[PDB]
Amino acid sequence: ERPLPRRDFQRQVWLLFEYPESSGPARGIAIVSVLVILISIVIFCLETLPEFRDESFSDPFFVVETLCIIWFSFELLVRFFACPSKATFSRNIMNLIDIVAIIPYFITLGTELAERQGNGQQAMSLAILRVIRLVRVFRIFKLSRHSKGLQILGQTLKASMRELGLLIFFLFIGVILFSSAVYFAEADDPTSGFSSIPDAFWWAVVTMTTVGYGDMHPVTIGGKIVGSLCAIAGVLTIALPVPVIVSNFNYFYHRE
Amino acid sequence: ERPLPRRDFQRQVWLLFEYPESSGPARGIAIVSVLVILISIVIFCLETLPEFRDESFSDPFFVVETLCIIWFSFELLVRFFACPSKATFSRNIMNLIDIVAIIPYFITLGTELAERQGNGQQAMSLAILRVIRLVRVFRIFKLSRHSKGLQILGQTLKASMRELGLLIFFLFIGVILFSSAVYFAEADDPTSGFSSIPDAFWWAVVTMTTVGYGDMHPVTIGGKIVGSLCAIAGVLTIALPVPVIVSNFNYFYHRE
Amino acid sequence: ERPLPRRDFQRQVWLLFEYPESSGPARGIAIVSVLVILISIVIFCLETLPEFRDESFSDPFFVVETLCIIWFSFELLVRFFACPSKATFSRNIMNLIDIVAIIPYFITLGTELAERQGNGQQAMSLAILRVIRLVRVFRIFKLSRHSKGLQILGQTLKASMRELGLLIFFLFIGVILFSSAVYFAEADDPTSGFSSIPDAFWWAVVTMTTVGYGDMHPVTIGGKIVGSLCAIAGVLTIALPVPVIVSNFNYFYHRE
Amino acid sequence: ERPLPRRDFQRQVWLLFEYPESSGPARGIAIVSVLVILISIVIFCLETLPEFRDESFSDPFFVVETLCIIWFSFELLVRFFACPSKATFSRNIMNLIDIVAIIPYFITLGTELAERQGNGQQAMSLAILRVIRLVRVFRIFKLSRHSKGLQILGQTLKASMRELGLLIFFLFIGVILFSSAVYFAEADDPTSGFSSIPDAFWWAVVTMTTVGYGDMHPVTIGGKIVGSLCAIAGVLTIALPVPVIVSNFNYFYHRE
Ligand SMILES: [K+]
Ligand SMILES: [K+]
Ligand SMILES: [K+]
Numbered sequence A, B, C, D: 001e002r003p004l005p006r007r008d009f010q011r012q013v014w015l016l017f018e019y020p021e022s023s024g025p026a027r028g029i030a031i032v033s034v035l036v037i038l039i040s041i042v043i044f045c046l047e048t049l050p051e052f053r054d055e056s057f058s059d060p061f062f063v064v065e066t067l068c069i070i071w072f073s074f075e076l077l078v079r080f081f082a083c084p085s086k087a088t089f090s091r092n093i094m095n096l097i098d099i100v101a102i103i104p105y106f107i108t109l110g111t112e113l114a115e116r117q118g119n120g121q122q123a124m125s126l127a128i129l130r131v132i133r134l135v136r137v138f139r140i141f142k143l144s145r146h147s148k149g150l151q152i153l154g155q156t157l158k159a160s161m162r163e164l165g166l167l168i169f170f171l172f173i174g175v176i177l178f179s180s181a182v183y184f185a186e187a188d189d190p191t192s193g194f195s196s197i198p199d200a201f202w203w204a205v206v207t208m209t210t211v212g213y214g215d216m217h218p219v220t221i222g223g224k225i226v227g228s229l230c231a232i233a234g235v236l237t238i239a240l241p242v243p244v245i246v247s248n249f250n251y252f253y254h255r256e
Helices: A010-018 A024-046 A060-081 A086-091 A094-118 A126-145 A148-159 A161-184 A197-208 A221-238 A242-254 B010-018 B024-046 B060-081 B086-091 B094-118 B126-145 B148-159 B161-184 B197-208 B221-238 B242-254 C010-018 C024-046 C060-081 C086-091 C094-118 C126-145 C148-159 C161-184 C197-208 C221-238 C242-254 D010-018 D024-046 D060-081 D086-091 D094-118 D126-145 D148-159 D161-184 D197-208 D221-238 D242-254
Strands: none
Touching: A010 A024, A010 A060, A024 A060, A024 A126, A024 B161, A024 B197, A060 A094, A094 A126, A126 A148, A126 B161, A148 A161, A148 A242, A148 B161, A161 A197, A161 A221, A161 A242, A161 D024, A161 D126, A161 D148, A197 A221, A197 B221, A197 D024, A221 D197, A242 B242, A242 D242, B010 B024, B010 B060, B024 B060, B024 B126, B024 C161, B024 C197, B060 B094, B094 B126, B126 B148, B126 C161, B148 B161, B148 B242, B148 C161, B161 B197, B161 B221, B161 B242, B197 B221, B197 C221, B242 C242, C010 C024, C010 C060, C024 C060, C024 C126, C024 D161, C024 D197, C060 C094, C094 C126, C126 C148, C126 D161, C148 C161, C148 C242, C148 D161, C161 C197, C161 C221, C161 C242, C197 C221, C197 D221, C242 D242, D010 D024, D010 D060, D024 D060, D024 D126, D060 D094, D094 D126, D126 D148, D148 D161, D148 D242, D161 D197, D161 D221, D161 D242, D197 D221
């Protein structure tokens, strides 16, 4: 188990914010957290449309974000307020997700107020600002608190690291081998889409995995001879470590 | 078992219309029902061609439908006429399929006679009438009475609801994650098909499941780096709960 | 076992033409049959090129066929010459393959000599003559005499007829359902490739099985909503009876 | 086990160059070999770009190759210098990979110096020189010394030769059968991409394996009827001997 605060207000509060099975208020708090997470995801994925892109203070999009960040920060602060051991809090993982999901809103807001008002700046960089906007998407994983499915998935992926390594390794070797073969089989032809070996990598990964987008396909006979072998060998290299991961997931899931 | 009427005419009739193993007439009735269902499906799927679309009373298409509806209604009425318990009849499922397959023909016919003759109407709506035409397709499931395969499938799908939930959940998370990544990796380029994050959802679902229609594919290098990972992760998220459903079906089917 | 002729010449001959494990000559005869089969297949698949198509007596293509038919007929006649029981010969299957592979050459040749010389004819029909040319391809299955793999495959396919029926049935139901849904979701749009429900069948089969050729894909949002579900449900309906057939093949193959 | 030299310098040297678990220097040597292999692969795959292609002595690309070949030759020579039995050295496989990876650099260099200086030559041939450049790619397999994954893969592929034969055989039969059917179903149409049976082979292999590049697809109804059956039968013929190979790999990998 875990220690309990065994006190007057703090123990009651921590049982409220930690165990959704306790009472009516615990279920209410949990549903509130789920609703706010969903709202924030929709806001993030919606503000990127062509229509509102155009070319702050009262915009509809800029409000909702502040409300969601307020609620996340309040929840994190209260949850940390009554926590028995600090070492466990540091060693956890959900708290890392929460703090990472709260950081970017402070950085963006913080950066604009100080610099624009009292300095001349590029932005920072086109790349730097763009990079942050992307990190803002980790709010999905806050649903790990409310579903056993994601936690089972996390444990399965942690247990099976080595097989992931093997799968990527076999894919890499196959990609290099077949890219080289099909580039050299089509150098003499003028009308070929393969300009260099680093350009056939995309074709090799899209053919081994059986997606086959349809651009860059062989035309010479020597090209087709190799494009068949790539298709055949993709299945063989892909399907080797799948049973291990499926077995791990099934055991972790049906365990209880 | 089930109670039997244990009477003079009604018991004989219900044994005729319920158990196709009894006699010659039972087999004849069953084959008649199968023929009529097939005819009705062909009529529904055939009257939609470009040729007879053009821009009622004696049309070839409008007759056959009335005959099929007559036979379905007669069969349902007779089957319900001699039924021991009403609660079982309400709690069943095949009867729901039958009544749902009979409703739309009455609504369409019923609506035209009263309104056109004595009122001015839009139709109802373009959408409303169009919506009903689609519901007319549930006549296929009336074959659940005549094949063990469909009933095995129904039981398997009922038992494995949770794994279906998990599969859709993992797909949804993967879709959002990779759509966001590949939209942000291709914002700077002018010649890109991805205008907004809600526009990359189609690409993500068509790549994770390995269909790969071939429109909307990445062009920048940063786009290709992510389009490879989507292809790899689609297999992993798809192939997790398949063994459970296959095991359920195999057990339900080979049970007897 | 099987009866043996137990005689002077006929028993020796039948042991020569039936059991390739006996002696050196048996192995020589077997290799000769394999070489002739391969030659005939190459001739059939080669005479169809654009170059020799253009718009008989001494053509290179017309000779080789007569030689191969001569050898096949000689082998069949000798094999039947010393056969203990006639009922077994009729009830076999390899002999059916041999006679079916020998028939078309006689029909084509036979038809030209009598009719052209003494009558005026269309050909017979464009379709009739074309149909026969296709039947000429059953010469491949004569390799069932020389590989255990094909015979294992034949036994597996014979044992698992019912699961094949179920697979086709589920595919048919899924095809009709999703074709109807995606035709009705795209009637209002002008620029759609789906003209009628019988036209969406091709899209449904190419999407459920995850080939995805790339013509005929949805454009409206309502179309995409259904095109995702088709992709998901294809895997589910395809992957149900595969384990049974794989188990049958594995048992029949590893049995000995 | 294996014999040990049991001597003063040679035994110490062979333990250094053979067992990376011994000491610090053994780990250093192993990491050096890995770094050099990776460098050489990058050089080979990088010198083929459009930019440095243009239309030796001090080029950046021509140096690095000489350094890598020097190190490979030194390592091979030292490893062979202290080897107990010659028969084992000949019967090994890693040494074959090393000598094959060292040969091409000598041939290319050797050929240019003698012939250009004292003779007039074509090159040798466009094909001959091109063929060698391709063989230069076997440097990847030198990583078999430093990963258990590749060695497990080698043992699995050696054990399962027969199932590979069966898979290719079933694919070949299916390809011929469906190519013939879909060529004859589309001869009458003018606007068809299938000019001859040898031209439909590419379509058959790309459809059976479910890649589906998207050129060459059927247009007539008779063509679509067969293009569906090809898609269905590809899964059946592909998925038969996969369980055997997966079982072999799993046993060899989880053995220890
Ligand atoms: K696929
Ligand atoms: K495709
Ligand atoms: K595909």
